[PDB]
Enzyme design. Structure first.
Site, PDB file in Angstrom:
ATOM      1  N   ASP A  26       0.856  -1.180   0.000  1.00  0.00           N
ATOM      2  CA  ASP A  26       0.000   0.000   0.000  1.00  0.00           C
ATOM      3  C   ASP A  26       0.899   1.240   0.000  1.00  0.00           C
ATOM      4  OD1 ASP A  26      -1.705   2.146   0.469  1.00  0.00           O
ATOM      5  OD2 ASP A  26      -2.852   1.112   2.033  1.00  0.00           O
ATOM      6  N   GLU A 127     -10.236  -3.763  14.764  1.00  0.00           N
ATOM      7  CA  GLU A 127      -8.994  -4.203  15.481  1.00  0.00           C
ATOM      8  C   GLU A 127      -8.837  -3.548  16.857  1.00  0.00           C
ATOM      9  OE1 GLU A 127      -5.180  -4.434  13.313  1.00  0.00           O
ATOM     10  OE2 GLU A 127      -6.182  -3.903  11.443  1.00  0.00           O
ATOM     11  N   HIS A 280      -5.428   0.148   1.054  1.00  0.00           N
ATOM     12  CA  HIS A 280      -5.857  -1.209   1.370  1.00  0.00           C
ATOM     13  C   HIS A 280      -7.069  -1.197   2.318  1.00  0.00           C
ATOM     14  CE1 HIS A 280      -3.713  -0.714   5.199  1.00  0.00           C
ATOM     15  NE2 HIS A 280      -4.352  -1.791   5.611  1.00  0.00           N
TER      16      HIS A 280
END
Ligand SMILES: Nc1ncnc2c1ncn2[C@@H]1O[C@H](C[C@@H](N)CC[C@H](N)C(=O)O)[C@@H](O)[C@H]1O
Ligand SMILES: Nc1ncnc2c1ncn2[C@@H]1O[C@H](C[C@@H](N)CC[C@H](N)C(=O)O)[C@@H](O)[C@H]1O
Lengths: 337, 328
Positions: A26, A127, A280
C-alpha cells in the site's frame, strides 16, 4: 472466544506474511508515513521514538533515517523476529531496538520524545488498536511530545454503488445471454446482497458518491478522555443533500489521519476517501436493506456510532440511524465482516 | 449435509456459476446438441439450483423435466420456471435427490456436480445414486465422463509475491530482502490446496491425463471412497523455478463430435480455476528435466465433502518426496 484465544488469533494474523505484504504494498499508506515522519525531522533529530506495533520494523527505520537517536520498536506478534533481521540488515540494530510483547507491559528505560504508530483498521476502529496507542502515550510519552499521526477524522457520504447495481441487474440480463428469463431473481439477490447486517469493505470511486462528504467525528489523540469515548461510542449526526437522481444503496464510511507539519507548517493528510487514491483500507459500506430512489436536493440525515462488538472487542460494530427524504426514520445495526 | 446446502441458498454462488460463460455455454450447447436424444423424453436435473439447465432441456425438446434441489434456492427455481412459461413441463421438487420421490424413472440425467479439483464437495456420489435409482436402462448422462489432468507449474503470481520483499528498497529505501525465506514458508510451506487461476505460460511441461471417470461405470462409487487418480511423467519445456503442480479437469458431453468443457489454464478461464499443490519451496528445473509422480484424490477423513490430495513426486534426480494436501 476468551481473551487469550482472541489475542492469539489477532496476533497470529500479524505473524503471517500476507498482511505485511498488503500494508507495505500500500504505497499511499507507507509513503504517507515516510513523508509524515520526514516532515517532523526537526523534532525527531537526535531524539527518541516509540513505534507502537512495529510489525516488520519499517516505520521505526523511517524514524532512524530521519535522524532519531534511538527507536524502541515494540511488536506483540511473532513478526518481531523478522523485524529484528530487517533492522540488522539495514545497519540499525545499535539504535533501533525491536522489543517483543504488548506495548501495555513493555518497560522502556526512558520516556520518549515521540510516538509513531499505524493503528488504523477497516472503518478506522476495527482491530481496536487505538487503546494501545493511548495507553503508550499516557505511560511513555514526554510532556509536549510528538504523536505521529496526531489525529483522525471520520467521514460519511451516501452512495449508489455501481458494482452492486450491476450485480443486482445481472439477473435481468441472463435472457439476452442464454435465452432464459431470470429477471424474477432480482428481489432475492437484493435480500442476499443488501439485507444482511455486515459491514462490507469495498473500494468506491467518486462515481458512487451521492452528496458532499461530511465529517461526523474527530479523534484528537492528545486528548484525555478519548479512552472513555471509545468504550461509549465514537461518531455523530450527519445531514447532506443529494447531487442528483440515483438509487441510494446506503452509506460509505472512511477516515483520514493527519501528521503535524513540523518546520514546514504544512500538515500531511493520509486519506481513505473514495475521491482520493485507493488504499488497502478501501471504504466501509453500510447497505440499506434495499435501494431507495433519491433525487437532486433530497435530504438524507442520520447518526452513526462506532463501538466495539460485545462478542469480540476487536470487531467493529456500527449503529446507524437514518432518514431519507420524507420516508420514516429507520435503524440498522452492522458488524464487521 | 445442511451446512453444505446452506452455501447454495445464497445468491452469490449462483451468480458466479451463471456468470461463468464457459461453464454455462458448455452446458447449454451440450444439452441443445443432444436434442435428438432428448426430444419427447424425460429428464432429471440433479441439483437444479435456479433451474437454468432444466430450461435448456425443455428447449432441447424434453417432454418433461424433474428439477430436484436440496437448498432453499428451489423456491427461486420454481419462480424462474413459471416466468419462462414452463410450469406444465418442468417440475421443481425440493429436497435431496437421495430421498426425493420422483413420479417415474427418466430417460436422461443432467447435472453440474463438479467442485474445485473436480471432487471437492463430493456431489458426484449423489449423481451416481440418482443414476442407479432413477435412470432407465440405456439412459443418457450429461456430461458422461470426467478427466483429470496434472502439470508442473511456475506460478508467476507466487514468484511476484516472494520477490516483493527484494523490491522494497527501491520503493522506500528500506531493505527487506531477508523476508524472502519467511514469505516462502508462509506461502508454500503449508498443506492446503490453493485455488488460483494460472495462464499457459505458468505450465512447465505438457499436461498429463492421470485419471478418467466414466460415470456409467460399475462400482465407481467405491472407487471414490478408496481414491481416484494415477501416475504421471513429463519433461520440462525450459528453465524455471518449479513451484509445484496444478490439477484440473474436463467433462465431456455425448456428441449428438463430443463437446468438452475444460478448466485447463491453456483454455478460457472458468470459476473453478485450477487446484494448486505447492512444494515446500521452489526447485530449479531445466529443459528436459524429468518429473514423475502419483496423485490421489480422496475425501478428507474428518469431512467427506472436503477434498484431500496425496502427492508423490520426483524431480529429476532428487529423491522421491510426498506431500499431503486438503482443500483450503
Ligand atoms: N498492543 C500491542 N502491542 C504491540 N504491538 C501491537 C499491539 N497491538 C497490535 N500490535 C501490532 O501492531 C501492528 C499494526 C500494523 N497496523 C502496523 C505494522 C507496521 N508498523 C507497519 O506500519 O507496517 C501489527 O504488527 C500488530 O501485531
Ligand atoms: N444431494 C443433492 N440433492 C439435490 N440437490 C443437490 C444435492 N447436492 C447438491 N445439490 C445442489 O446441486 C446444485 C449444484 C450446482 N453446481 C448446479 C446448479 C444449477 N444446476 C446450475 O447449473 O446453475 C446446488 O444448487 C446444490 O444445492
Amino acid at each position: 472466544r476468551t481473551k487469550s484465544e482472541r489475542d492469539q488469533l489477532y496476533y497470529e494474523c500479524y505473524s503471517d506474511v500476507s498482511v505485511h505484504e498488503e500494508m507495505i504494498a500500500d504505497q499511499v499508506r507507507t509513503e504517507a508515513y515516510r513523508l509524515g515522519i520526514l516532515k517532523n525531522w526537526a523534532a525527531l533529530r537526535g531524539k527518541t521514538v516509540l513505534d507502537v506495533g512495529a510489525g516488520t520494523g519499517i516505520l521505526s527505520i523511517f524514524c532512524a533515517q530521519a535522524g532519531a537517536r534511538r527507536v524502541y520498536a515494540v511488536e506483540a506478534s511473532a513478526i518481531w523476529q523478522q523485524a529484528r533481521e530487517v533492522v540488522r540488515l539495514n545497519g540499525l540494530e545499535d539504535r533501533v531496538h525491536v522489543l517483543p510483547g504488548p506495548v501495555e507491559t513493555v518497560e522502556l528505560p526512558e520516556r520518549v520524545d515521540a510516538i509513531v504508530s499505524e493503528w488504523m483498521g477497516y472503518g478506522l476502529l476495527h482491530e481496536s488498536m487505538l487503546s494501545s496507542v493511548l495507553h503508550a502515550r499516557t505511560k511513555w510519552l514526554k510532556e509536549g511530545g510528538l504523536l505521529l499521526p496526531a489525529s483522525a477524522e471520520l467521514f460519511v457520504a451516501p452512495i449508489s454503488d455501481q458494482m452492486l447495481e450491476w450485480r443486482l441487474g445481472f439477473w435481468s440480463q441472463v435472457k439476452q445471454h442464454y435465452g432464459v428469463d431470470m429477471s424474477c431473481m432480482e428481489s432475492f439477490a437484493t435480500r442476499c446482497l443488501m439485507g444482511h447486517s455486515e459491514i462490507v469493505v469495498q473500494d468506491l470511486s467518486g462515481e458512487d458518491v451521492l452528496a458532499r462528504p461530511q465529517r461526523f467525528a474527530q479523534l484528537e489523540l492528545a486528548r484525555a478522555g478519548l479512552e472513555q469515548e471509545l468504550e461509549a461510542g465514537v461518531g455523530g449526526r450527519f445531514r447532506c443533500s443529494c447531487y442528483g437522481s440515483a438509487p441510494l444503496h446506503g452509506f460509505a464510511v472512511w477516515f483520514q489521519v493527519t501528521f503535524p507539519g513540523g518546520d514546514s507548517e504544512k500538515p500531511l493528510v493520509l486519506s481513505t476517501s473514495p475521491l482520493h487514491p485507493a488504499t488497502h483500507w478501501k471504504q466501509a459500506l453500510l447497505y440499506l436493506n434495499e435501494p431507495v430512489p433519491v433525487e437532486q436536493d433530497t435530504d438524507i440525515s442520520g447518526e452513526i456510532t462506532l463501538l466495539p462488538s460485545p462478542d469480540n472487542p476487536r470487531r467493529l460494530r456500527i449503529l446507524l440511524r437514518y432518514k431519507v427524504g420524507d420516508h420514516e426514520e429507520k435503524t440498522k445495526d452492522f458488524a464487521m465482516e
